[PDB]
Amino acid sequence: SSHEQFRAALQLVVDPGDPRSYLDNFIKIGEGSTGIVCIATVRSSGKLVAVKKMDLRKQQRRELLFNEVVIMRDYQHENVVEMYNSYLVGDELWVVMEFLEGGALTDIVTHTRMNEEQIAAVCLAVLQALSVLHAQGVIHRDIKSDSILLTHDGRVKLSDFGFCAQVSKEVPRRKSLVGTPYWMAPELISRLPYGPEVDIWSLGIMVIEMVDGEPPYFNEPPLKAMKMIRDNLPPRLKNLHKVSPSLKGFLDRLLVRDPAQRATAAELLKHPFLAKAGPPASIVPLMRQNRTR
Numbered sequence: 001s002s003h004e005q006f007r008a009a010l011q012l013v014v015d016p017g018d019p020r021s022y023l024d025n026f027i028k029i030g031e032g033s034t035g036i037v038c039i040a041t042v043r044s045s046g047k048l049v050a051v052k053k054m055d056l057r058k059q060q061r062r063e064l065l066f067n068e069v070v071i072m073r074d075y076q077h078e079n080v081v082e083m084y085n086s087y088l089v090g091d092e093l094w095v096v097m098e099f100l101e102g103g104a105l106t107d108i109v110t111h112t113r114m115n116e117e118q119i120a121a122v123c124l125a126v127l128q129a130l131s132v133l134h135a136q137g138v139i140h141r142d143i144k145s146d147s148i149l150l151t152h153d154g155r156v157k158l159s160d161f162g163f164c165a166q167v168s169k170e171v172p173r174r175k176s177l178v179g180t181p182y183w184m185a186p187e188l189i190s191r192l193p194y195g196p197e198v199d200i201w202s203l204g205i206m207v208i209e210m211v212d213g214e215p216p217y218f219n220e221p222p223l224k225a226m227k228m229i230r231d232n233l234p235p236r237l238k239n240l241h242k243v244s245p246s247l248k249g250f251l252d253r254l255l256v257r258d259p260a261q262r263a264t265a266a267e268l269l270k271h272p273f274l275a276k277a278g279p280p281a282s283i284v285p286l287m288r289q290n291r292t293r
């Protein structure tokens, strides 16, 4: 059947063999929409790595499994989690990656208020990554706080590229409904032709996460949230009167319904709000203590 075809094709783009020849003591530490995240130990090194496992049979869009392993192969950027190897183990794709020991931004957002120096530092890191990716024609398509990982010393890296897409001169736009509902851009929900700008909208929703503690419409059923994103004015900060005019002006350039008028990552790197961006040391306290909103 087509599963055997897809499996054979995937085997052609991953590394050969079974990584159980060198990885020990798998422990599940998390999960997302396509599979689970484990930690494992290198038998020779004592080195810790992260291993994502994705069952080919459980994917709504299995062809998307190719994209990450291929597009992000050998990708080296200071704000992108490094991928080391990938394997086909039975009916599962395993991707071996660098282990980020500060956890995900989501755990920060649910447990502590962030100040604007810290929000700006996160935005700056993500935009440095997106500026390079977008210039290369890569759309991430799952920007949200759970896709953002931290080191213990406060460095910020983008992960979870499993929904990513490649655009080009010949095919400059995608139309697939891909992402996580509450973060999806309205043109993407509408299945209109879209480009890298969808990531900028999603980043705007993540700024609302950092300020408010959750995205708009978060306890709404996801299909209803998507209709409200598609049809209503851009969502507002609950804590609108608590943020600076600079932060609001920045957000106003991200949450723009018309994708042609939404700011690009390269434009946003010039925005004065990002002059507030603190160094990694400013992020460290957020992983060690809690402060209520």
Ligand SMILES: Cc1cc(Nc2nc(C(=O)N3CCN[C@H](C)C3)nc3ccc(Cl)cc23)n[nH]1
Binding pocket: 029, 030, 031, 032, 033, 037, 050, 081, 097, 098, 099, 100, 101, 102, 103, 104, 146, 147, 148, 149, 159, 160
């Ligand atoms: C690829 C990778 C992940 C990672 N560290 C982590 N990933 C996940 C986890 O399971 N996630 C977070 C990202 N989004 C996934 C869908 C689910 N949870 C963690 C909890 C505590 C600490 Cl200390 C590190 C974590 N290092 N390298």
